[PDB]
Design an enzyme around this catalytic site. Structure first.
Site, PDB file in Angstrom:
ATOM      1  CG  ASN A  11     -10.283 -10.376  -7.530  1.00  0.00           C
ATOM      2  OD1 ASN A  11      -9.343  -9.574  -7.745  1.00  0.00           O
ATOM      3  ND2 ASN A  11     -11.196 -10.149  -6.633  1.00  0.00           N
ATOM      4  CD  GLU A  18      -3.043  -1.216   1.901  1.00  0.00           C
ATOM      5  OE1 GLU A  18      -3.010  -0.424   2.865  1.00  0.00           O
ATOM      6  OE2 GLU A  18      -4.005  -1.979   1.610  1.00  0.00           O
ATOM      7  CD  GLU A  48      -3.256  -6.686   3.388  1.00  0.00           C
ATOM      8  OE1 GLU A  48      -2.048  -6.363   3.361  1.00  0.00           O
ATOM      9  OE2 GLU A  48      -4.086  -5.946   3.925  1.00  0.00           O
ATOM     10  CB  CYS A  69      -8.833  -9.354   6.539  1.00  0.00           C
ATOM     11  SG  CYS A  69      -8.337  -7.649   6.975  1.00  0.00           S
TER      12      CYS A  69
END
Ligand SMILES: *[C@@H]1O[C@H](CO)[C@@H](O[C@@H]2O[C@H](CO)[C@@H](O[C@H]3O[C@H](CO)[C@@H](O)[C@H](O)[C@@H]3O)[C@H](O)[C@H]2NC(C)=O)[C@H](O)[C@H]1NC(C)=O
Ligand code: MT5
Ligand code: FUC
Ligand code: CL
Length: 493
Positions: free
Chosen positions: A365, A230, A335, A337
């Site tokens: 995706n 990020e 990533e 969550c």
């Protein structure tokens, strides 16, 4: 095949209870296999049915187009943070093995990817980098602490020993040493001092090689690294945990002048470099800035993306458009969550909804060219931690240390419906529906040529359907409300 020991904590579904001595674990011709998981409590249950020669009726029909070939799959896995390592290691060794087997063995869900932070992130109990001695531009004092040598490294070894399939490791850093940063701190708004091409950038690139060298000495080698976790976070004032800010131009020049040349001139020149490692709303802009410079582009194998702001980024406009302009640069989801939002409860034991979020994201995706999908922490405690800034989130496996127990949540099984049945080298193929419907579905071909179809039902209504494989036959089935199914059959037979 030991069955799930179900336990409710008052949310929409159950978790499966595992401990030191018990954990739940895992066609002919022309039949198909069906694996099913339901809100009501079915956990990857196996059944079988006949492939039929004919079909009549006006019901929903999903038709394979096996000659429409799309991306090949890298795979699926999760992250070995300090918090995941500390949680797993707080179990008795037998419960530890059952937890690693759940993820990595053929008796579990067959993960083949492990993301490894380079030094500390928010899911650490202290802040540290590998080179904290100030102004050590030589990196003479670079070294791995016990977080790596006693926690993460031995668990990654154990996962590799248990693994069914070859496992790929992916590294990402959150912050640099603070003496390399404009603000002198691990968090907050700040970037590397100076400009790419200079001593600060040169030292930061060397740190990556040092990290690779040190893991190689512990007999671990990396499939890929990302250029920064990020990068946009460090552009944000007050950003509360480890970060290191890059605009796209700064990342482009750093890859071109420092990080690409440094890796290519090292023993680790075969490690792939992924750019971005950030929200997909940043695409296609970031890909255009970095990849239209041919000095940067020659080093970039692919683009990593995170899911946190997906509600702002329709996959077609971002992922689809990036594929269209840069078809040979793989997209990879590195990533995700749930429970990250400030108004969300961090951990909801047994949440069916959170499971569906995973599989809906994964299917979406896959349908937009993404080659892999990586969860965040492999395991967390019942509070979603530990985490030095209290940025608690959910995890597919929740560890209850005072009881030597762990819980496999519905996220774990939603993930398993892909990771277990879609090995590396599998390839997505076309699939069209005969009419509008509330299902998410994706079809792929295994390396051996067999078919895999995953169907998530997003509505509460049971939906009968047929799957047509042209020149093999028809599979008559039903998708119960909220359920997730994986269908496997040999066609080439
Ligand atoms: C580790 O988890 C194991 C799986 O739950 C657990 O074992 C199983 O424990 C239950 C509860 O004691 C047993 O259960 C039940 O069976 C008895 C005996 O027939 C019945 O009278 C009860 O009504 C109840 O339904 C299981 O039979 C038992 N055996 C196995 C291997 O499944 C272990 O006890 C757990 N270890 C710890 C430390 O808790
Ligand atoms: N935002 C979040 N929530 C959890 C996760 C953080 O734990 C992680 O460090 C970041 O990469 C970030 O993108 N995250
Ligand atoms: C077979 C099981 O083993 C363990 C114990 O905690 C249970 O009570 C049961 O005896
Ligand atoms: Cl609630």
């Amino acid at each position: 095949a030991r069955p799930c020991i179900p336990k409710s904590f008052g949310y929409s579904s159950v978790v499966c209870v595992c401990n030191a001595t018990y954990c739940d674990s895992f066609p002919a011709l022309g039949t198909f296999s069906r694996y099913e998981s339901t809100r009501s409590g079915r956990r990857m249950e196996l059944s079988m049915g006949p492939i039929q020669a004919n079909h009549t009726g006006t019901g929903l029909l999903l038709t394979l187009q096996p000659e429409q070939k799309f991306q090949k799959v890298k795979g699926f896995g999760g992250a070995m943070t300090d918090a995941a390592a500390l949680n797993i290691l707080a179990l008795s060794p037998p419960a530890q093995n059952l937890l690693l087997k759940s993820y990595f063995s053929e008796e579990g869900i067959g993960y083949n990817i492990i993301r490894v932070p380079m030094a500390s992130c928010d899911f650490s109990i202290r802040t540290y980098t590998y080179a904290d001695t100030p102004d050590d531009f030589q990196l003479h004092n670079f070294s791995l602490p016990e977080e790596d040598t006693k926690l993460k490294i031995p668990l990654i070894h154990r996962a590799l020993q248990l693994a069914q399939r070859p496992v790929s490791l992916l590294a990402s850093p959150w912050t640099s040493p603070t003496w390399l940063k404009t603000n002198g701190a691990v968090n907050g708004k700040g970037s590397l001092k100076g400009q790419p091409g200079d001593i600060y950038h040169q030292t930061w690139a060397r740190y990556f090689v040092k990290f690779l060298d040190a893991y190689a000495e512990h007999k671990l080698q990396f499939w890929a690294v990302t250029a920064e976790n990020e990068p946009s976070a460090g552009l944000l004032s007050g950003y509360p945990f480890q970060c290191l800010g890059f605009t796209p131009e700064h990342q482009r020049d750093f890859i071109a002048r420092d990080l690409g040349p440094t890796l290519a001139n090292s023993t680790h020149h075969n490690v792939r470099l992924l750019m971005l490692d950030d929200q997909r709303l940043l695409l296609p802009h970031w890909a255009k800035v970095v990849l239209t410079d041919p000095e940067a582009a020659k080093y970039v194998h692919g683009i990593a993306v995170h899911w946190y702001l997906d509600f702002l980024a329709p996959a077609k406009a971002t992922l689809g458009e990036t594929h269209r302009l840069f078809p040979n640069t793989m997209l990879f989801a590195s990533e995700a969550c749930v429970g990250s939002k400030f108004w969300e409860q961090s951990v909801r034991l047994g949440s069916w909804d959170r499971g569906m979020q995973y599989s809906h994201s994964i299917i979406t995706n896959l349908l937009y060219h993404v080659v892999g999908w990586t969860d965040w922490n492999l395991a967390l405690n019942p509070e979603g931690g530990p985490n030095w800034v209290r940025n608690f989130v959910d995890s597919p496996i929740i560890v209850d240390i005072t009881k030597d127990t762990f819980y496999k949540q519905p996220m774990f099984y939603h993930l398993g419906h892909f990771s277990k049945f879609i090995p590396e080298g599998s390839q997505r193929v076309g699939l069209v529906a005969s009419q509008k419907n509330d299902l998410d579905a994706v079809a792929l071909m295994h390396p051996d040529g067999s078919a895999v179809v995953v169907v998530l039902n997003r509505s509460s209504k049971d939906v009968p359907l047929t799957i047509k494989d042209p020149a093999v036959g028809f599979l008559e089935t039903i998708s119960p409300g909220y359920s997730i199914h994986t269908y496997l059959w040999h066609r080439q037979l």
